[PDB]
Amino acid sequence: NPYDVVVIGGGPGGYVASIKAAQLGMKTACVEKRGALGGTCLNVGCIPSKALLHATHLYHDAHANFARYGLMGGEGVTMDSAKMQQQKERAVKGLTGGVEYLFKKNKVTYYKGEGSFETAHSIRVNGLDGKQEMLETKKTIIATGSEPTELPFLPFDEKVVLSSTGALALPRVPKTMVVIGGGVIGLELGSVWARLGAEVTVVEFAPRCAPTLDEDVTNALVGALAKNEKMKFMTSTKVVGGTNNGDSVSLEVEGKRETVTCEALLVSVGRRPFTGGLGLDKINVAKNERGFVKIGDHFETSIPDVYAIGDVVDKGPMLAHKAEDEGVACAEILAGKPGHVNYGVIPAVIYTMPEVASVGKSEDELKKEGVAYKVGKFPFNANSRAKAVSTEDGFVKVLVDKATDRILGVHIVCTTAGELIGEACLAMEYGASSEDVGRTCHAHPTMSEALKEACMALFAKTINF
Amino acid sequence: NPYDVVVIGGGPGGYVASIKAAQLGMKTACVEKRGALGGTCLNVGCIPSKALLHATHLYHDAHANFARYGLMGGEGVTMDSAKMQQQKERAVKGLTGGVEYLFKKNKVTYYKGEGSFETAHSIRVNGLDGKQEMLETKKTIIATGSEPTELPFLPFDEKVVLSSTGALALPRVPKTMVVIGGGVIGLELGSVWARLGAEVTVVEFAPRCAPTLDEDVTNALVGALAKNEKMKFMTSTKVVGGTNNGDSVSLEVEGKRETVTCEALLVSVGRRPFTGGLGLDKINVAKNERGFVKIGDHFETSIPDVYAIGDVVDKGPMLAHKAEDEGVACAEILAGKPGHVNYGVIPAVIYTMPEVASVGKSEDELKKEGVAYKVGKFPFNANSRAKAVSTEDGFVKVLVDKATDRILGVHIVCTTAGELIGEACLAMEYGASSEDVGRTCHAHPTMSEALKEACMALFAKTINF
Numbered sequence: 001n002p003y004d005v006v007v008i009g010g011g012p013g014g015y016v017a018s019i020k021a022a023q024l025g026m027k028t029a030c031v032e033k034r035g036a037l038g039g040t041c042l043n044v045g046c047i048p049s050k051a052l053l054h055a056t057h058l059y060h061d062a063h064a065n066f067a068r069y070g071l072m073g074g075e076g077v078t079m080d081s082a083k084m085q086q087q088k089e090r091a092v093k094g095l096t097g098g099v100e101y102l103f104k105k106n107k108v109t110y111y112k113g114e115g116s117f118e119t120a121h122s123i124r125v126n127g128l129d130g131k132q133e134m135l136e137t138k139k140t141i142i143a144t145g146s147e148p149t150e151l152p153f154l155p156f157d158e159k160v161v162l163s164s165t166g167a168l169a170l171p172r173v174p175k176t177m178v179v180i181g182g183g184v185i186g187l188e189l190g191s192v193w194a195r196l197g198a199e200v201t202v203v204e205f206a207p208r209c210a211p212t213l214d215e216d217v218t219n220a221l222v223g224a225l226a227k228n229e230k231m232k233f234m235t236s237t238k239v240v241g242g243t244n245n246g247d248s249v250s251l252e253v254e255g256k257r258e259t260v261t262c263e264a265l266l267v268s269v270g271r272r273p274f275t276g277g278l279g280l281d282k283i284n285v286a287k288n289e290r291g292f293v294k295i296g297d298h299f300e301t302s303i304p305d306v307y308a309i310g311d312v313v314d315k316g317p318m319l320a321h322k323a324e325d326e327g328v329a330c331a332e333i334l335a336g337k338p339g340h341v342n343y344g345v346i347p348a349v350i351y352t353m354p355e356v357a358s359v360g361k362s363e364d365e366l367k368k369e370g371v372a373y374k375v376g377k378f379p380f381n382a383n384s385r386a387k388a389v390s391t392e393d394g395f396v397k398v399l400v401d402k403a404t405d406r407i408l409g410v411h412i413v414c415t416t417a418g419e420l421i422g423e424a425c426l427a428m429e430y431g432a433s434s435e436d437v438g439r440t441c442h443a444h445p446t447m448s449e450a451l452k453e454a455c456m457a458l459f460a461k462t463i464n465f
Numbered sequence: 466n467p468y469d470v471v472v473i474g475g476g477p478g479g480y481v482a483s484i485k486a487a488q489l490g491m492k493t494a495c496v497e498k499r500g501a502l503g504g505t506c507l508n509v510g511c512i513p514s515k516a517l518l519h520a521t522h523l524y525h526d527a528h529a530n531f532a533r534y535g536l537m538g539g540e541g542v543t544m545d546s547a548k549m550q551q552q553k554e555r556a557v558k559g560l561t562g563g564v565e566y567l568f569k570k571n572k573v574t575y576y577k578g579e580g581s582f583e584t585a586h587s588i589r590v591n592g593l594d595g596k597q598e599m600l601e602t603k604k605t606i607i608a609t610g611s612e613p614t615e616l617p618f619l620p621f622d623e624k625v626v627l628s629s630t631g632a633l634a635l636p637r638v639p640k641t642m643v644v645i646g647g648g649v650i651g652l653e654l655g656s657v658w659a660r661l662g663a664e665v666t667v668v669e670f671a672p673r674c675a676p677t678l679d680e681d682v683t684n685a686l687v688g689a690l691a692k693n694e695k696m697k698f699m700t701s702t703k704v705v706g707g708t709n710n711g712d713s714v715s716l717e718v719e720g721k722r723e724t725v726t727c728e729a730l731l732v733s734v735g736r737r738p739f740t741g742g743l744g745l746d747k748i749n750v751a752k753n754e755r756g757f758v759k760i761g762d763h764f765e766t767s768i769p770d771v772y773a774i775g776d777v778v779d780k781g782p783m784l785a786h787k788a789e790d791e792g793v794a795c796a797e798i799l800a801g802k803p804g805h806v807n808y809g810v811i812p813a814v815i816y817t818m819p820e821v822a823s824v825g826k827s828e829d830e831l832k833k834e835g836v837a838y839k840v841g842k843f844p845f846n847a848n849s850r851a852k853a854v855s856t857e858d859g860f861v862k863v864l865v866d867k868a869t870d871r872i873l874g875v876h877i878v879c880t881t882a883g884e885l886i887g888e889a890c891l892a893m894e895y896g897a898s899s900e901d902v903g904r905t906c907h908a909h910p911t912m913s914e915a916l917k918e919a920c921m922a923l924f925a926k927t928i929n930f
């Protein structure tokens with residue numbers, strides 16, 4: 001054409017890198033094959049899952065908690081699953097259409113089709129309309145993302161053997177559902193359907209669910225899931241075989257064998273980096289054994305002028321805000337500015353109820369690294385707001401360097417953990433000590449006071465516990 | 466006895482000062498006349514109001530919003546006002562009993578009765594059980610708080626002419642209710658009853674409600690109150706007379722006269738510092754013309770060894786977290802430590818729905834002070850989480866010094882503003898610039914991203930708007 005930058009992939013990583021590059025003055029194009037912008041996150045990930053977790057949480061509260069507050073008739077509330085899915089699609093549509101508008105507003109040229117490398121500076125676009133085009137550019141950002149990991153002996157058919165995409169689109173509540181993989185995606189998607197009536201069983205190979213989190217955190221979460229959603233957990237369990245019977249699945253597991261039968265199986269064991277059809281081999285962009293594109297500190301691949309960000313790269317966790325910050329940083333670097341991402345401060349949130357939010361290091365990691373640390377913990381059953389509205393589950397746990405009082409990690413389990421973690425992120429970005437946070441005035445009554453007091457438990461004593 | 470410190474008043478200010486002083490090693494006693502600890506806030510303020518706002522918000526959502534998400538039958542939900550009040554009392558009881566335990570745990574000696582000064586070092590306690598005692602102490606902290614301002618021509622009877630205490634305890638929904646004073650207490654309490662069916666009219670002397678807030682903020686709030694609670698507002702209106710008819714009230718107002726009739730009148734024009742029965746005149750502790758106890762930078766009154774904190778003093782806003790931080794600081798100062806409160810960073814939250822949270826300066830103040838500032842504003846109708854769950858009201862507004870990028874004020878209107886403001890408080894406590902917050906990774910999707918992006922609109926451009 002020629003372009004200054006061509007971004008392949010329109011997910012959180014690519015659409016943000018595209019807008020930021022355009023804003024910085026670069027002639028930018030974004031190639032996306034799906035037919036809609038927003039990538040995995042907006043279309044079949046972040047957004048539809050949070051939309052269904054919200055609607056189902058309202059439903060659960062009406063049935064389980066309304067009476068405690070004086071509300072009668074909650075038992076009469078039912079969920080029209082077709083209308084529920086329709087609102088979810090409406091929400092997704094509002095966001096994906098919004099990104100197209102931002103592209104127009106920022107003058108990003110949008111190509112609908114699959115992008116492939118011809119050379120490090122020429123990209124072939126196989127248009128969705130059949131037409132082919134060759135893009136010439138100075139720089140290219142690979143933001144092709146990831147896809148669900150399939151079990152080789154039980155391929156997805158998105159009818160009974162489901163990936164997260166199929167599970168988000170079920171037209172009716174399954175009677176029974178088994179979830180393989182007790183990670184963030186399995187727990188969120190299992191909660192959606194368990195709230196509406198499905199008998200859900202989670203099968204996890206590790207000793208406990210969300211193995212990346214400390215045991216006191218996952219304990220608080222699984223205890224709530226077992227009590228409220230009535231989910232059943234089978235940890236230290238391996239899946240050894242299975243059969244797709246067309247309208248049900250038979251799974252064989254072992255902890256001693258056993259067979260489980262379910263109407264719907266959600267396989268959420270992991271996600272793998274996706275570079276299919278990209279032509280990386282043609283230009284020799286290096287990948288590690290897991291298939292991730294290898295990058296350096298400035299997002300550069302092994303090939304000059306070709307960069308990569310988001311889920312496809314060998315750095316950081318596979319999360320949307322990580323891809324978004326890498327997109328901004330990469331665009332800034334391409335414009336001659338000093339961009340960078342702080343990989344030591346990337347939060348992770350589980351939108352179950354209660355929610356779980358973490359940033360920084362876990363105790364398991366500090367123990368592994370031999371760091372001497374102090375723990376400040378404040379339970380929500382002692383917090384003013386949580387007691388006032390009767391949603392007392394969870395706690396805030398702050399880990400500090402026993403020598404310098406610096407905050408090393410913050411973990412929160414409570415109804416509003418996702419929004420509380422932003423304060424902890426800013427604290428860590430700044431290298432704050434527990435005393436810095438503890439001496440800041442927090443509004444009363446708020447759940448953020450539990451963060452203030454857990455910090456006070458580190459450098460002094462908490463007041464309300 | 467003798468004591469190192471005697472605290473008169475067991476509200477947020479006194480009970481926290483008592484625990485902190487005890488923790489620091491001082492032999493401490495707390496004198497409280499009410500019969501329960503927690504002061505205004507726990508007993509007839511913060512807690513019961515947030516408990517009713519929560520229950521009524523669930524009720525409103527069931528009727529107004531359930532259908533949009535696919536939940537049917539929300540129309541059949543009713544509120545048993547007796548059970549609603551009973552849960553509120555349960556919540557209050559759990560918190561006030563908890564403070565008594567903290568006193569026991571910390572070895573604070575608790576006297577139930579009215580405290581009065583005999584001399585600057587001897588306090589008479591008129592016990593609730595009739596018995597009198599004399600306390601001798603080295604230092605005294607006055608934390609006697611405040612009380613509702615009464616209209617001289619329409620005294621409270623807590624039956625039809627109500628203060629916030631009477632409005633929180635109504636046994637049934639009034640048909641009509643007029644609220645005099647469109648401030649935080651009137652708006653929260655008016656929302657509670659409007660949600661349950663009362664026709665509520667707010668009468669405010671100022672041009673707009675919550676006059677302390679910027680017009681774009683109050684506009685967003687009053688527009689929601691008018692639409693959802695169907696509240697009617699009469700601003701620039703003066704109350705000139707009234708008659709308590711026993712089972713109704715007739716109010717005469719003027720903007721041209723007019724008479725309004727209501728079943729219940731909430732007078733929430735303000736609160737005044739309370740020092741009744743304290744004997745301040747006997748020891749000459751100085752008060753300003755409004756009745757506030759005058760204090761210096763270390764909370765000292767005009768009389769050596771006598772200090773004061775909380776609602777009763779001539780400093781800061783009348784808020785619980787302010788009293789609590791003054792209590793900690795004062796206790797620290799009495800133990801020989803350097804305590805202090807940062808009055809420029811005290812947040813304020815309105816727990817209506819949407820919520821409003823502010824910290825730092827408003828635009829009206831910056832204009833008044835001639836500060837050259839930049840405004841970054843991001844609306845929630847462009848935020849990932851708000852769109853995903855369809856609760857798009859409000860925005861985040863960040864005010865920065867146009868010269869140094871330093872954050873001067875943050876104002877938020879949205880469903881979760883109260884918990885979001887803690888991040889803004891830490892930012893200001895640290896003297897952060899908008900770029901500092903804008904470059905921090907915030908989890909996606911969260912409403913906290915609107916704060917990140919409003920900051921980005923100051924030093925650069927937002928991405929999603």
Ligand SMILES: Cc1cc2nc3c(=O)[nH]c(=O)nc-3n(C[C@H](O)[C@H](O)[C@H](O)COP(=O)(O)OP(=O)(O)OC[C@H]3O[C@@H](n4cnc5c(N)ncnc54)[C@H](O)[C@@H]3O)c2cc1C
Pocket residue numbers: 008009010011012013014031032033034038039040041042044045046047049050113114115116143144145146164165185274275276277278309310311312318319320321322323908909910
């Ligand atoms: C069910 C689910 C829920 C999730 N929830 C959350 C959450 O709440 N918060 C969170 O932080 N993360 C969440 N994630 C993870 C999140 O979706 C990812 O971290 C994220 O999308 C990072 O993505 P990206 O831009 O690198 O990838 P992308 O979103 O995956 O990449 C997407 C795109 O690249 C395009 N593409 C690939 N190859 C080509 C090509 N050759 N030519 C043209 N286009 C191509 C694809 O069509 C697609 O649109 C969730 C994931 C799932 C599956």
Ligand SMILES: Cc1cc2nc3c(=O)[nH]c(=O)nc-3n(C[C@H](O)[C@H](O)[C@H](O)COP(=O)(O)OP(=O)(O)OC[C@H]3O[C@@H](n4cnc5c(N)ncnc54)[C@H](O)[C@@H]3O)c2cc1C
Pocket residue numbers: 444445473474475476477478479496497498499503504505506507509510511512514515578579580581608609610611629630650739740741742743774775776777783784785786787788
């Ligand atoms: C309806 C309502 C809702 C509110 N909501 C909030 C909110 O959500 N957040 C917020 O920050 N603020 C809120 N406030 C304001 C909050 O209650 C005050 O800022 C707060 O209580 C500051 O108080 P304190 O310790 O100084 O006063 P206190 O709580 O008022 O003082 C209370 C005590 O002093 C005792 N006392 C007085 N004189 C004597 C004496 N001579 N001897 C013994 N005892 C004595 C009284 O009995 C009482 O318990 C609210 C107020 C009201 C009325």
